[PDB]
Amino acid sequence: PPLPDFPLSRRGDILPAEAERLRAEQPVARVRTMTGDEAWLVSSYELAKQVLEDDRFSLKDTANPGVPRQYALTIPPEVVNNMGNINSAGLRNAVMKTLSPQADRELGGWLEAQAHQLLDRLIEQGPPADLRDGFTEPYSAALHCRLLGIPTDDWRRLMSGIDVAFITSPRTFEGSAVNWYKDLGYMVDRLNADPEPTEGLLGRFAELRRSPVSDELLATVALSLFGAGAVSTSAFLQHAIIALAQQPELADRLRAEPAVIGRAVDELLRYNLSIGDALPRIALADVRLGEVEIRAGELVLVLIEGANYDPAVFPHPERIDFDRESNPHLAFGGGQHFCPASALGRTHAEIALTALVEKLPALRLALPVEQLAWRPGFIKRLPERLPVLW
């Protein structure tokens, strides 16, 4: 027989029909990834949660030489185990402090001013505008520059590094390594500036070195937090914007009841299709999952949108609903590798969307949603441009 192909459709404004078929017919399914390797794709909520919470399915080992892959590695293999290294070298406190919105008491107001500065610029020029290049991208880059303690002068160059680093390729491509060492050197340069960095992660790193871990490791943590955070928050915010543009009753709700923003972002997180690949794990032992015997060394892929649209857990999953009794979604993952920046991720989006619905109350797409250009060959699903009117 012929295996289902993975990944699924690049279109991000509706659940791929194949994700619903996989969950209903084979919630654990043998698929052929873009590399030609085979994998177990897990698409029901119950089994996805199980995999994430069972440490016999290893994220760290997905980077090992010889294992099957959903796409070529574009970063050093130790970086897939970023949190595992952050913990072992005594970096966790500096990292966890940086990721905590409660440790930066100005963050809230500063993010709000950043959002409004960007939106005011767009309003001055008049519609239409591209809310990716004109809003999400600079806003997400500005946040992560603040997190690291670096200026925003080179934010376009840094976001362009993300455009290469998060490519999904069937085979390794020259360029991934060149791109990695390019921005690793950038981070080293910032850490080792004569007027040594204060503020943010690089400021904490500078202090940590003078106390009684190498420069390459410090910059690696800085670079991978910048790239992973900026690309994930920018892509999620783009998906959230599309929802509020296509469903203006949701923006009316946010304007009428500003305090629902927390629940609203929690539901947009469940709904959002920005994860354009699956969460990967290598089985370290034989494990039975659902009706399938998974053998040690095989690749397991957790399909987050399959789980988050599972009607056994989320009634009317295809309908955005800010008033669900229960919303135990997997948008941030689960288990050991649950997103350590989930609070910052929520803050980023809540503040941006609050500013957006206030400043652009007639927000709508400037063209039918089916004519958005969805980026191919990337870890995230995202529109190449997000043209809107207001």
Ligand X SMILES: Nc1nc2[nH]cnc2c(=O)[nH]1
What does 205 interact with, of a copy of itself, ligand HEM, ligand UYM, none (CB < 5 to 8 A by kind)? none
> In whole angstroms, how close is the CB of 384 to a copy of itself at the nearest point?
5
Residue in 205, 224, 207, 200 with CA at minimum distance from that of residue 215: 205
Decide if residue 7 touches ligand UYM (CB under 6 A).
no
Considering only 277, 298, 305, 350, the residue that binds ligand X (CB under 6 A) is 277
Per-residue x/- mask for ligand X, residues 208 to 237, rule CB under 6 A?
Answer: ------------------------x-----
After which residues is the chain discontinuous, taking C to N > 2.5 Å? 212
Helix, strand or coil, per DSSP, at residue 123 = helix
Q: At CA 140, angle to CA 242 and CA 49, rounded to 5?
A: 70
Q: Does 380 bind ligand X (CB under 6 A)?
A: yes
Residues 110 and 123: beta-carbon distance below 8 Å: no
DSSP β-bridge partners for residue 129: 388
The span from the CA of 4 to the CA of 16, in Å, is: 13
Q: Which of 27, 138, 197, 227 binds ligand UYM (CB under 6 A)?
A: 227
- Sign, CA dihedral 62-141-168-373, equals positive
> Considering CB distances under 5 to 8 angstroms, the limit depending on partner class, which of ligand UYM, a copy of itself, ligand X, none binds residue 41?
none
Closest CA to 146 of 103, 201, 92: 201
Instruction: Report if residue 275 touches ligand X, rule: CB under 6 A.
Output: yes
Closest to 227 measured CA to CA, from 172, 282, 182, 174: 182
Residue 275 site contact among ligand UYM, a copy of itself, ligand X, none (CB < 5 to 8 Å, cut-off depends on kind):
ligand X
Is residue 375 part of the contact set for a copy of itself (CB under 8 A)? yes
Question: Within 13 A of 71's CA, how many CA atoms are on the CB side?
Answer: 19
Any bridge partners for residue 96, and if so which?
none
Question: In the set 34, 42, 344, 382, which binds ligand HEM (CB under 6 A)?
Answer: 344
Does position 233 interact with ligand HEM (CB under 6 A)? The reply is: yes
Exactly one of 204, 329, 346, 385 binds a copy of itself (CB under 8 A); that residue is 385
Q: Mark the segment that binds ligand HEM (CB under 6 A) among 10-18, 23-31, 185-193, 340-348.
A: 340-348
Amino acid letter for position 92: R
Q: Does 158 bind ligand UYM (CB under 6 A)?
A: no
Half-sphere exposure of 368 (CA within 13 A, CB side): 2
113-142 residues near a copy of itself, rule: CB under 8 A: 125-130, 133-134
248 forms part of the interface with a copy of itself (CB under 8 A): no
Q: What is the amino acid identity at position 289?
A: L
Q: Which residues bind ligand UYM (CB under 6 A)?
A: 74-75, 79-80, 82, 165-166, 224, 227-228, 232, 379
Q: Which residues bind ligand HEM (CB under 6 A)?
A: 59, 82-83, 225, 228-229, 232-233, 236, 279, 331-333, 337, 339-341, 344-345
